[PDB]
């Protein structure tokens, strides 16, 4: 009698099935798309969290082949200054994420507040590569219509909308002109969205439903939340993510506002390379479309 | 070979799927029905437990937009006096639950003992709004026939019967003239009904089976038991409850026989509003009929 | 590809669904059959364990309306003496289990060793009511052929065979002339049969498969193992057991070789009566055939 | 939308169903095949781990009726010397595993490194019985083509390939000429393959898929990983393993590079014999093909 749409799976419900392989971890390609217009050399994004991404950590992420999204828990002028610091950082890093001018890539988050138009303007004038319209509920008037507005007003900036967890949301963001979507609503066990609101979609099913909805559109999806180990990251990719956002795991690093960020990155990319080796996936498109899961009981 | 009627789900088996939303938590309507004849401004009832609801806590609940049910672990004259204190409390509280005379609403519990007729009479003469015929097993001769008797003898009082957990019980209460039913048998893990008697129905399935049985009748159902966080409350509503009863969570408050009851109420209603925001539900009827669950493994 | 016969359920996988009731716990009948020829006033048997049942505890069990099975971890002459002590105990206990001569009922266990014929003879000459051919694996030549032999050689004694856990075993025991079968192989989580041999059948499915196989034969089944609380006992009955054997739970009692056995009995029968009240079962035959389970996730 | 091939089961998801038995633990036969050409008197292999198998432990294993695989975390000349020590050990042990010359059997592991050809040559010249081409991912060019090469270059040595976990891998190894395959990828909960790479197949399903793929070929499979108790071992056999590899459980023994290895062996074989007794399996071929599982919830 309950209105149950499906059974939904998280990282711990599934394992990657090994497949034939002739490719070594060190030899696979980790190149992917952050957005329609933006490629990354590794599928790794740092979160728009005030304990995680400002200019220093965003610089390190771009140098590694990923990208940082500058958080929006600060003033407009501070946020544009963080963006400028990244875009002016003078560049040893053959993998760096860079724009057509050879400047490091950066993103910046915006919300739905009264200040959003002015914020987007200052960030775009500062040379931002991507504006991330980023709330706890991306399938909402505030997010979608803001994504529509950025796309129509600043047509040479990339726009990401999130956070979403359903096929329907992905399409509503695609129709608004989103160049990528970010996936993750209540993705961890015992996070405050589940406890407080009773709301959430287990992340492996969320990513897969959104990947299926977006197939053939050219719109990438970013998996944000619920990743604890590098094996989770591999699972997110096989479920259809184009890259993965990490937040609190980077929060203790030198670069954040325990050690170098580099170590953490290399360990995360190490496990992913291992998982590509096990599944026989030579590049990210193979990893996203070919390996299969087994479902497990957790016994 | 076992006589298993179904697999049944509790709060932890399910999450609310976010849906399109243009409504903010602060803007949704929490208006609902306690019974056929009685509306509440918030879907919240305090339990007929001797550590929870007497006149002081019942007053606070009515002022908040809900209602208190005075417990029956006391004498008949004490219980009527508790009711009178509520009905005479002189009323800053625009949400108050009130009768057609502007007096705060109150309920009172009765059992099946030899004293029930006299108890119901004293409570009705004291101006009670609702009589709650309330045992550990509402699908029983003692409860149903007592509900029939109150309805036939005092036709201007509202009557609730409980506790039940099945479609069949809901109908048997509806046929007896019940103006609402209360749902909850063995609703928590490791509660004494499960340990001692082996008896229970997981609460999300219980509420849904009873909501389905009652559809189109105009008879509301109250979810009583197994709610630990405000997210559980939201889930109870989506499963079809019209409001939710809380007991031990209020037991430490100033008003009960750690802080003000108000804080607890506002936090509980806060999470519900958040969950209505996430699901795009502007009012309680939307919340009860439109949002969907995903089933989770608990991995 | 695995040879999986079914998914099998234990006590914690299921709950009793409340049903219509007009019967109070105190008013239900607990009368049942231990065997074809032997009735008990309560469905409770004490185990043939050297820490549980000798003459003193067997006497108390019979006085309560159940029966004790004297354990076989002792000499033949000691075991016959334990039986004689019970049969001569002079009988305040209106519920007592008694034979056609007014003597308390007793059972005694035998194994498969070289001494079995002589043991059965001494026990029968001592006036035993039931011989329990009792090993860790009742579906075996040693048990079945011993049951056949007792039935053919001492046709005026009742014979129970165990322990079994399948339809096929029940039938093989019925064909050998067994007057009842005892059910329970690897019935607890983390018991030594599961850890050491990897062998076991969850007890709710075991009881149901054996009850289904025995339907219409007049052969009762005794549920032995995995019962921790009185609610488990109720579940065993609904799954089709005619009575239930308890071992280590009685091991600390005065009567065993923390308090009086009586307290434990009354608490166990209290929960069962409560469960009969909840399900509307006036007697044991109703309890075994009418109430239904819901399956639960354990979330 | 997820690419889930199946639900897959580990040891804790299943129990052996007892079946009719007239055979005692002590009387069953534990004779089996390690490879096409090699029989063992017990289905037990010690792992190619640097804390487990060198000449002393390999000698003890062969004397017990099993076999040791000498680990490859050492130099080529050291490994051939370990093999020679086993082949020259002068032989009280009626169960010993021996070649056609009366010398104890031994195996040795090789990897995929540049040194493999020279390693295989030295080991074969030292009189090795079986070469185990042994990596973390046997379904790979490095393993399969190395198995092909050993078979084509040294046609009088037995070759095992591993580790694998799928029907497809088993066949690819069979086609390369493998005389047996070794099964086990991410077989334990929380092992580093699952945490780091997100990769694994629950071991009962792995063994069954590989056994089904290999049926009628004459190629045995060895279950390697995830066995904690002797009951797990029995389950591995019923799922279709011909024998079972143990590693860290032997790591504390006298013979390894807490007590005698013998005790551990006898306890492991004790539980297996018990499980054969329960299921009525007189020999290993009966155990692999006849007993059935029940699936359990872990409640
Ligand atoms: Cl690898
Ligand atoms: Cl919200
Ligand atoms: Cl009751
Ligand atoms: Cl046995």
Numbering used by the authors:
A (entry chain A), B (entry chain A), C (entry chain A), D (entry chain A): 1 to 91, 205 to 370, 426 to 467
Paper text:
Inosine 5′-monophosphate dehydrogenase (IMPDH; EC 1.1.1.205) catalyzes the first committed reaction in de novo guanine-nucleotide biosynthesis. This enzyme converts inosine 5′-monophosphate (IMP) to xanthosine 5′-monophosphate (XMP), which can then be converted to guanosine 5′-monophosphate (GMP) by GMP synthetase. Guanine nucleotides are essential for signal transduction and DNA/RNA synthesis and IMPDH therefore plays a pivotal role in the growth and proliferation of both prokaryotic and eukaryotic cells. The enzyme mechanism is thought to start with a catalytic cysteine attacking the C2 position of IMP; an NAD+-dependent dehydro­genation then generates NADH and the covalent product intermediate E-XMP*.
Here, we report success in this endeavour and present the crystal structure of apo IMPDH from P. aeruginosa at 2.25 Å resolution. Also in common with previous work, the cystathionine β-synthase domains, residues 92–204, are not present in the model owing to disorder. However, unlike the majority of available structures, clearly defined electron density exists for a loop that creates part of the active site. This loop, composed of residues 297–315, links α8 and β9 and carries the catalytic Cys304. Analysis of the Ramachandran plot revealed that 99.3% of the residues were in the allowed region, with only two outliers: Gly226 and Gln458. Furthermore, PaIMPDH possesses a structural motif that indicates that this enzyme belongs to a group of IMPDHs that are susceptible to inhibitors developed to target CpIMPDH. In PaIMPDH these residues correspond to Gly19, Pro25, Thr306, Ala442, Gly445, Met393 and Glu417.
